Symmetry: D2
């Protein structure tokens, strides 16, 4: 499947990204779905605004060096230049970070099912990843989404999603790109915490069997899951020790140790819940043989975005907000996080990007 | 999963294609694969050469019109005009024929395996089928490929080409297009007839499970299976009765009677051996609750292509060769067939198009 | 797996049992669960009563010869002698019938599931079947049960039941015993007809993949399914043309043609509904490439039992009731059935035996 | 699926067994398999000979009591009394030890396969575990067996021994008994180390999927895996560091950290090679989030059995041999081990007991 030279390259890359203290910034929103984040702060969705906004994030003045191993970028963002003319991958790489690339092509429905979806992307994938590798990306991301309704997530969806996740992983590692396997269970719903924990266990079990089946090399992988969390509409209330227990036991029962790190997705939690729960998790007493960090998008950019507010004059003001959150999360990601747009929940029904 | 009006349209469309005596012409070859076909008769691979050849086949005389209920076309040639300026789909729909479109986008390796392959094309398939339906196509073809070797076809290779065919079928049918699922086991190899049987059985069983699993509507499908023949390099010889029993046994054990019909591919058999074997099969005493007919590419055009020689002067001779193999096959799929470049083996190693 | 001599023996046996006009009498109730049928007619459950009652059935005076190919007997009933000293297998075999044997050992729950069950039996099976073969049994039965609730029948249960069914089938054919594969979907419930039809399609798809997976020889098998039928508690009303359509399309979409016959279980329908629906089915216009007959227990013995009423003096009176029903069902099993304890529904919540 | 008190009892019981330094003695041999062990030292296979041998092992001095937290017993010997009239389970429970019971009932062929096997014993397992729990047993062992050959272990063989182990685990745990799931890949064969690795990986991956699928509680399980060693007849030699990395890699890629501990079997290694390899494994720099210890049959008793010679006079010499291998292993499972019939290969072809 893979030579040893090729396994060292992936294992290396994978550990780099989640070395101690570091997480991933998810700046990988599609054009259409970044556009509605910009509309949130009354900014027109334009190549330059998008470029400007991404540039603000990749140029954050260096206390974020120890906190941000990697950045997932959307396809166009990887071919965009800082204002000095320098391509964004080289701007971020020079500072010791690693560039990632969102390669899925969005979700697609599953006939005969109660709203579930595959996602698509695999076509032309390997040649795309060849390009993205030569243009500076050392890891990729692929988002699949399941939801919890009563007859959701069905076997059919879990089986097909874990499988496409495995196809993609296998194509990425062929091209020396560490795959990020994201089986996101959406928080959409009334479900309680344990319901979510069970669905997450069944999903990840299915994904890691799929990965085994497709002979993907787990030491050169990372996993971006949802934390385990009550449904949005869940009335019952659950602590962060309970969410971190639920989340950590879910992961100990499914994710074999060889997986090099677990970079959590925000899930639509507020920026601060995200860092508290991330921290709680790392402080969970149980034994956690993988890197438990963050790959947050919205939970590292809410404060930033509403600082920037479409206006060039706050660039520094927005990127100091960004930095604050990265530092918060680089401590949560060690257990060392002790602490109001950052508490605004960032929930989005059927989050798409 | 599908409304009743939709199941009616599919069921109807599928029964038209494979009504008694009708078979299908597979004119579905890639510009890359009809390349090598044209070089075998000195002709250059130029659009109007492709357009002309395809034009010759589709415009054969109406002695063929009870023999050919459908034509699988390649993308390009769905959108070419004949010499009257008529779009190709109409010249054929005018005659009471049905226009099929190949939707797969080639094959692609499966990492971890001794040579095996999966097939790609699902990205965008939803919209493509939609357009193709508005533009004439009423059925689609997706080709999957297993080879037989000592560790081939893997379990992973079977489970992946099965759950891609199903994904594809699911999408065609939601867009009102009758999928032809083609799980082709290639004759490449030394293998016994009984071996090709066991593989053929195990494959169809995993296909029909997959179609079950994705809630496909078997009444508006067709199976395009290989015959079960010994390897191309097999030393033992087996009778046309044995090929014909092995094929009809293998399918009696795996293919729900609900499937509307099955369109055999030629596989590399000579034109004439295809007709004979199709005939033995339909003359088999066993009970075969589906339509057993042909969807032949090379075993309808070889005689016509060599007669065509690239020379516009040869048109009606080229076509009355095509027309004879169409009449031969339209009796072989009824049992009534009875009888030199139509004797030639048309075997390409690892066929691809 | 199996030689050809061994495949002829099974195929032979299987066709014998479901030759035209013939069905199977299911006299295979366990001791404890026959005891509550006897309690129904105020008879003590004793070796002799049980023997007497079984003997009454196997000795029915010869117009049942053309109607009853086979009889499934419970284990003790196979070692019991008619009053003339003759062992029951030899009494029934002399008349041209074939003896069958119930080899499962009842159901067992599935941890973590909403009431579902495996069944058990496989242990020591092959040596048991060796004995049952030498003692006259040429076919066996194995009952698995699924139910329809909202979260019933789960994947886990369908997967494990279809698998044990396949294990058992494979052990039976090793010992020249034709297996009867019964995936019974219980009528317990409020479900409508199509719900049942879908669950039956998903179940049988799963069973026939399982059989393929375990390399069982379908031509030497029979299948005892539920018909497709509204739930007991279903309020909506459905015709017999609708139940026969539902049942026949369900079977055309799952049961490959090689399966030699389909012997239906009564399901708790009244004795007469059972024969009407069986008949309707055979008159379904759609193409039915397997034998569609009956393997009824309760729908051939309700009238008999309440005739016999624990009293030796009605023996002839009870066995003329038995005969009537066998004849009714040997015509329904041809399509030729034209027609009040026989309309008493025989439904039993979680039927067990 | 299981209450919290029950999960506590299982989790506790499992942690006792495999607490730091403790390992398990597998005294679990069939009367048929301890037959051939006794004939290897001239002793006749008589109950009191079995009783005495077992008595010798269980009553070794309390220098062993930090080395042996459990004993897997065969059915017979759970119910034998020592010389003080004490039941065996108590003589061992008295010392702070835990009594294990083997519940499998031998293996049985899988038809359709080149030699492969499944294992039986699930019939009655529910009640048996119940009794066994009341009578002393707090954990069970079920042995499954894959061999490595060219078409071995089949997919069917893996999926069947996986879903039997899970059925078994499910039943033990509902009856409050900690299952030891033993997927043993036998060293029979010519195969490379890397080969045994790939098979070992693919097997555990299908096991842990199965346990997921049946809702097993991994905190109250133990894995009894083979080491990953080259075939018994392999020509290449591999270092104790390589065996030890291959074993610990294979498990890091498949075994959820939730599993309480893993008890290696001896496999045929010499007593001494078992201790060395257990030690290399625990001295591996990789991170191993589970307890890595021993559940050794032949690699604890060989020295003791040859010393025993059948001669009651040899008792304390027999046992201080046993006790030395118990002390050796109780350091090898801590890394602290450092160092002639304990050098002998104990390989039985196709081991069975």
């Amino acid at each position: 499947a893979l030579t040893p030279e090729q396994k060292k390259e992936l294992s290396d890359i994978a550990h780099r990204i989640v070395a101690p203290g570091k997480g991933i910034l998810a700046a990988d929103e599609s054009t259409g779905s970044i556009a509605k984040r910009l509309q949130s702060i009354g900014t027109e969705n334009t190549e330059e605004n998008r470029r400007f906004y991404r540039q603000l994030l990749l140029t954050a003045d260096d206390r974020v060096n120890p906190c941000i191993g990697g950045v997932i970028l959307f396809h166009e963002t990887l071919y965009q230049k800082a204002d000095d003319g320098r391509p964004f991958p080289q701007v971020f790489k020079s500072k010791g970070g690693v560039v990632g690339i969102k390669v899925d092509k969005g979700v697609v429905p599953l006939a005969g099912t109660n709203g579930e979806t595959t996602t698509q992307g695999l076509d032309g994938l390997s040649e795309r990843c060849a390009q993205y590798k030569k243009d500076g990306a050392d890891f990729a991301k692929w988002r699949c989404v399941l939801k919890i309704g009563e007859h959701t997530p069905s076997a059919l969806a879990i089986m097909e999603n874990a499988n496409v996740l495995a196809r993609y992983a296998s194509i990425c590692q062929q091209n020396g790109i560490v795959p990020i396997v994201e089986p996101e269970i959406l928080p959409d719903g009334d479900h309680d915490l344990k319901r979510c924990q069970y669905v997450t266990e069944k999903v990840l079990a299915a994904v890691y069997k799929a990965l085994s089946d497709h002979h993907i090399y787990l030491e050169g992988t990372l996993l971006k899951p949802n934390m385990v969390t009550p449904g949005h509409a869940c009335t019952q209330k659950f602590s962060h020790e309970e969410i971190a227990m639920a989340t950590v036991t879910a992961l100990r029962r499914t994710v074999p140790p060889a997986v090099t790190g677990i970079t959590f997705l925000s899930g639509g939690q507020s920026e601060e819940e995200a860092s508290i729960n991330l921290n709680a998790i790392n402080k969970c007493p149980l034994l956690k043989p993988w890197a438990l960090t963050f790959s947050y998008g919205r939970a590292l950019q809410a404060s930033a975005l509403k600082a920037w507010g479409g206006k060039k004059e706050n660039l520094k003001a927005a990127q100091e907000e960004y930095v604050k959150r990265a530092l918060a999360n680089s401590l949560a990601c060690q257990g060392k996080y002790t602490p109001a747009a950052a508490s605004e929940s960032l929930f989005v029904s059927n989050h798409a990007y």
